[PDB]
Design a protein around this ligand. Structure first.
Ligand SMILES: Nc1ncnc2c1ncn2[C@@H]1O[C@H](COP(=O)(O)OP(=O)(O)NP(=O)(O)O)[C@@H](O)[C@H]1O
Ligand SMILES: Nc1ncnc2c1ncn2[C@@H]1O[C@H](COP(=O)(O)OP(=O)(O)NP(=O)(O)O)[C@@H](O)[C@H]1O
Ligand SMILES: [Mg+2]
Ligand SMILES: [Mg+2]
Ligand SMILES: [Mg+2]
Ligand SMILES: [Mg+2]
Lengths: 258, 258
């Protein structure tokens, strides 16, 4: 008669946002739908949502004058201290005695900004997309392995207005609803946070900040960091961010346990 | 008069493969050339070689009927044992008590092959591109953080001839010279190795192998794994694989220390 909590949980795994007693028939129907969804992907486009979003974001920023960076994921532990992360400090995945999995893209991008200032014309515009890692207790809006986009500009035109304009163009391009709000944190400021309801899509900063001196930066700058899995969650109306992650359990938000 | 070893080393950092006393003038010339190279990239294409190669490889395999996978980089340690890696075992970067950085894409792809067999028509064709990690003593042809491509097919048409044909089409597409040779290893076989001179570009396997049973696989299959940094090294004639890596020291093989 009434579905159990465990049965409802099983059906929820197989339910997709656009879907509109006995359990076995409900399960059979959804299994059929999800198999057909995977079959359609396989027959036609064959692209993974996370990969495809990375490619779309890459095109957006390249076309707008930003240099594509691919920097190390395993970074020196000293970069954490140098970012002012003292006792986030408890969220770091340490590897060996001298390295960690990067929890953010900032330190590598600081180094690129400094180095490229010796070669490139003002303003210097760069971005990176790639894996980042944090130990998290939360499951709904957080992953321990996620994908960040960070873009930044240094030199001329590094105004709050320009930053808000890039953010607005970017999210209107992707078709993601948002509002920009004031907030603060230990590492940076004073940030602008880009929100979708109560979900943070991005934290953005208008420099300079005193942290810059440690990285050999003495020019104005602006930048923002976005989680790609959060963008996908909002775009595809996933109830849990696990549907948007690098995963063996979901493919393009479709359960692989069929 | 004569350049010192240290001076020659400095000039070699700034020398690019296509380049054709006192040290200060030689250094000044090369600095100028390398700055202009970065300026040209920034003015025109703005793509990173590693990112661009990933995108090109993605297009090749998608167009040939392979499903794009994005699976976890941090994987359970049990996957290592289950791959038959017992005491490579000393090359694994362990994280926490239960996880490691994946040294290869095989285990995740085995799981995808098994899972997708319940949904997709025969043959099942999949590929993944992404970071892999191994502790290495060698610096010239090895990185500790590298990027793998692995493709595989399971079911019908899983012949050595078909495998060699995919490999041949792929490398002729990229414009990379190669020969396919017989070899062997502890994990798989009996492999075919794809060589560029004495450099291994890929190891390839024609299944079934007895390892399959552990992963719930009982069908014929073929697959190959390629290092993207090795492909770039060969394509761009880099003397050291560090020029092709995720790096803060090189961008598209150009020194960032200018
Ligand atoms: N654990 C995570 N899982 C998924 N996305 C994340 C995670 N941590 C950060 N992000 C994304 O990266 C962006 C910038 O990083 P940051 O501002 O450091 O995150 P944060 O303030 O810790 N987010 P939250 O923990 O929800 O308050 C965030 O706005 C998110 O979109
Ligand atoms: N440390 C590394 N750095 C760069 N590429 C690598 C590394 N290890 C493996 N690869 C690439 O991944 C491919 C398949 O992996 P695998 O066959 O396990 O490597 P391998 O036999 O250990 N190579 P080698 O150590 O040179 O004999 C290789 O053919 C390389 O192109
Ligand atoms: Mg957080
Ligand atoms: Mg924040
Ligand atoms: Mg090896
Ligand atoms: Mg090999």
């Amino acid at each position: 008669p009434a579905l159990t909590k465990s049965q409802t949980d099983r059906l929820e795994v197989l339910l997709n946002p656009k879907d509109e007693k006995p359990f076995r028939e409900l399960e059979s129907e959804l299994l059929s739908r999800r198999k057909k969804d995977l079959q359609q992907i396989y027959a036609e486009e064959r692209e993974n949502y996370l990969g495809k979003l990375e490619r779309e974001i890459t095109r957006f920023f390249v076309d707008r004058g930003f240099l594509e960076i691919k920097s190390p994921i395993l970074i020196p532990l000293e970069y954490i201290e140098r970012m002012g992360i003292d006792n986030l400090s408890k969220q770091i995945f340490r590897v060996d005695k001298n390295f960690c999995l990067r929890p953010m893209l900032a330190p590598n991008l600081y180094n690129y900004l400094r180095k490229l200032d010796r070669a490139l014309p003002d303003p210097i515009k760069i971005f990176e997309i790639g894996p980042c890692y944090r130990k998290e207790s939360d499951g709904k809006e957080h992953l321990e392995e996620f994908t960040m986009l960070n873009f930044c500009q240094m030199g001329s035109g590094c105004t709050r207005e320009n930053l808000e304009s890039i953010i607005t163009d970017f999210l209107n391009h992707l078709g993601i609803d948002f509002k920009i709000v004031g907030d603060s944190c230990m590492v940076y400021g004073d940030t602008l946070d880009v929100m979708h309801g109560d979900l943070e899509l991005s934290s953005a900063v208008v420099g300079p900040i005193p942290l810059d001196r440690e990285w050999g930066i003495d020019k104005p700058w602006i930048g923002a960091g976005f989680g790609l899995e959060r963008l996908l969650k909002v775009k595809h109306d996933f109830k849990n961010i696990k549907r948007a992650a690098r995963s063996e359990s979901y493919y393009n938000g479709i359960s692989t346990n069929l």
